[PDB]
Amino acid sequence: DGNDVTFFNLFEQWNKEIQYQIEQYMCKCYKLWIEKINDQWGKQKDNYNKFRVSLSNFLFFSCWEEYIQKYFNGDWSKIKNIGSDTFEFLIKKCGNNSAHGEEIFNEKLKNAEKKYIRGCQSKTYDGKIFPGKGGEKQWICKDTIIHGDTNGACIPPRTQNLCVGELWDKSYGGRSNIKNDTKELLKEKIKNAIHKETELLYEYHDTGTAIISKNGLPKGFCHAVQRSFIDYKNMILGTSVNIYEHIGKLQEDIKKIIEKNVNAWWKGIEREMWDAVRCAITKINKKNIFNGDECGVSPPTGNDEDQSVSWFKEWGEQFCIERLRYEQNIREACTQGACKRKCEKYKKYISEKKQEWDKQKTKYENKYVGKSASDLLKENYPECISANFDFIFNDNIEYKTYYPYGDYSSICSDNDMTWSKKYIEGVYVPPRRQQLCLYELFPIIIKNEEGMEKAKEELLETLQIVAEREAYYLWKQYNPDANKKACCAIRGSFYDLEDIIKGNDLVHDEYTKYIDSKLNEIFGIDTKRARTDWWENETIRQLVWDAMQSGVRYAVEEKNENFPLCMGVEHIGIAKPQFIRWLEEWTNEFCEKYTKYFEDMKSKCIECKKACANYTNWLNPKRIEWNGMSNYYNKIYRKSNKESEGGKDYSMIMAPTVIDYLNKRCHGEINGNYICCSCKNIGAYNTTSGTVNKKLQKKETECEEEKGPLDLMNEVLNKMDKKYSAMKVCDLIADAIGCKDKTKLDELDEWNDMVLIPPRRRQLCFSRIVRGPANLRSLNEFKEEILKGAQSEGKFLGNYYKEHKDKEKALEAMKNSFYDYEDIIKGTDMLTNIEFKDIKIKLDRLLEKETNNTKKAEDWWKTNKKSIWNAMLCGYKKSGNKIIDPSWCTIPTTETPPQFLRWIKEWGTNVCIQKQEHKEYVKSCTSEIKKYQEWSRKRSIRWETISKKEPDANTYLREHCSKCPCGFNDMEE
Amino acid sequence: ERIVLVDNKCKCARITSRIIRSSEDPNEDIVERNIRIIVPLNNRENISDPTSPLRTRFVYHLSDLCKETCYTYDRNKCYTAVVPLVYGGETKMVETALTPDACYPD
Amino acid sequence: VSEEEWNTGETYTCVVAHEALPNRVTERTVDKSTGKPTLYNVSLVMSDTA
């Protein structure tokens, strides 16, 4: 369009800017500002109406594009990789289905505008009460295939030991005690259960037996009782993260009782249930006088309402407390024998907890996009401050050898990173600083404390070690004038290292946060002066720079290349402000990326569209980051240490505006010792360059519009089982019992009439239970687990098609079994007491009919409601271990075409092998070649069968089918 | 890692003196001799003579088989005996096939 | 029947219809476990010398 491309680019930038602003802003001037955007939004919509993807389509696509850009790296449109949990967050943030952008924008602004005896025994989950010794219950980091499918949440020991009370009796297995209970009776039962849970938790933590417990209430008792209340809430609600033995049946029965809407019931009785806990706490006064409000007048709610989050917080608190106890034991023992034994005990602990931490972090980070696990754990519980979970749970193989014990080993004596403001305004952390290694420092900063001289010595040694490692790795990374760019990159890393030692570091991630916190007491505003004093005199400056130089020497010697002039310089300049150094790094990166992408444009503009997407994607966030940089600079353009809001001095800039300071710093060429930045556009065009207005008038936004139709690909499956994974469900389901190595001899003219039945007689490897006379107990658990029990429907590539044919055909045979499986469930054409006219179809009807005719087998559960199953791909992967192509992964699962009742699909399979391989044999004695005409007579009866849409079977092979046209239409000798 | 010491097919035995490294620390590695025996439970006493009694006792002195009262038919070997046959009063000897599966002319 | 079907435990009943029968029909049931060894009598004797 004419003159609207500029409008479209302006609207895109303006949308992103306001979205970021409202996210950050989430008072008199705020009302003035919020109405300004309201009027501006109306003006933009009016112009967009003139323009017309739809306005509601564009907002949804923008939300998903931002997500795929920042939280997912590389802006790859791999919707396949994203799991089920994250889809929830995206549809919440970006809107359900599509074309809801107008509503999503509307609601966001509206949100902005509004800105006694019961049979429960004393708890033993974390250890039997004294004089009891053992009985510790471990975290159940497992998921149930039938209920919840894939769930990374780990059940806490406490939840496993929740006082179900009278709701559940363990007599002879598990039987719900509320099969026929009134709504009022259920409320009383739950109230008594909660009261008893509170009482038992109090007596468990008061004796100091809970790992947490090792006002006047027992330490952590309020946390435990609140979390038990949350677990009860999720038990009645039925939204349990993971279903334990008692959880599933109780959830189902409570759903049945209320709906004969559960959320509304609990939202009504939550006040009474929490009053139960308060009354229990008040009754505790008989032991000694607590008013009952210590654990909170209102029931727990908010971000902690999510049970996965609550369980993970409990895991964090418990693990941090245990880590602290191991720290005390190691310190007392060491400061051989007991010391070692404690060290291996800690190592075993961390090895045991690594899997649990990985699973819980994977669930929490994905479900809550952006937020990190360590931040939650550290902010919610002070006891976790002294632990860096990433360092303790590093997955690097060499890490275990380097630190067998972990963060108390000392006590036992890369280019795609986006400029992020996380752990910090508007200032952004360079990728280099995020990469600035602190790994080797942390064990020592843990080990050394309260000693001036030993702290100095060991900290200096490990500082030299980390400096050498960083020099080596950065030099290898940047260098495959190129050296001159790396020269200042080495300088910048050391230049940044000063602030961590000084304490002026702007970034406040876990690493530097703990480092600064411990230095506050090692060398201790005079505390900051004390650190600098070490940085001034023995110098330590020159010593660590010599360590830097030795590191680059080692790197270049490994590369067998000459030493550079830059690092041959021993005297360096005074350190510039951290933001100024980061601002220069940002500007230099902008120079490089802008030049590269613009030359790529001049050359390429066929994958021109990919280049346009890449260039626009790179440029768009840079505009917002530049806005932040300019804002901060205009805040500290002429400010001393006191005048500046932060406790840092910015008196040496001496330039009127940020773009002007860009001049006289990038004006010339890279020098290394003093110059680090150089753009082609030295002039004050960066402000216009950041906005996509000027360019060279080249119109590439049309491709961006051509990128918009990707929203169609953004389809939501809206099902609780994912066929993409990486695999999670594949481990749970077991091998089918009593069906042997199938496809033992198939498509070798074993076809026989009972219609010419293929080797579906045997390649179907149903479990014994369904195929046998025995009926099934419950469809939700046995037909459930038995149809998946035919993971043994994975012996095509497992045993037979492993190398007999190409990889694609093995998976094609599974497509045949799946549709066969589907028609076994409803009206196939086998005529056999186990597959058709059989009782296994009645096994389905019998069980669903037992469930009050909840749904016909041909209404739902027809391989439509739960058509996915595993799609047999687990069996494909179990033995063949061959990765399924994304296009190959949609046929083993559901597709709308049923291929017409097996009358013309099993026929489809005949020519796919049973005729084409004899064909190629013929093309490869003549009597044996002429012995391939008996399939020509057998074509006649099946031709009569099909004769009972297209005229005859031949055309079906010609046009419905893909491999069939290769086959000869008729043998005719 | 298995060292198959013996694979005698009459007295089916598969003694494998496989070494197993103990945990992560060597110098206490365990050595194990897995005497896997498949007693037939149905073969006749004189296995080549079908009309002989049933084996109710199976001696597996491992000393002898390390360096015969055959129990199990070997896969490669054919065990057979002559049989009388009458068609019209003529008693003609002929060889039998007690293990026809592995006795095809080869 | 296929071995995978007989090991499943299905019971096959041989209805025989005849004139002389007192009820004109008789049934016999064959099952996976109709003929089973009711008594396994194994006696492992493991020594160390000849």
Ligand SMILES: *[C@@H]1O[C@H](CO)[C@@H](O[C@@H]2O[C@H](CO)[C@@H](O)[C@H](O)[C@H]2NC(C)=O)[C@H](O)[C@H]1NC(C)=O
């Ligand atoms: C009984 O066992 C003996 C060996 O312990 C065998 O007897 C002879 O086996 C050879 C092997 O080919 C035959 O040629 C002889 O004819 C057998 N003896 C006689 C008397 O026929 C054989 O395994 C068993 N004996 C028989 C008769 O089957």
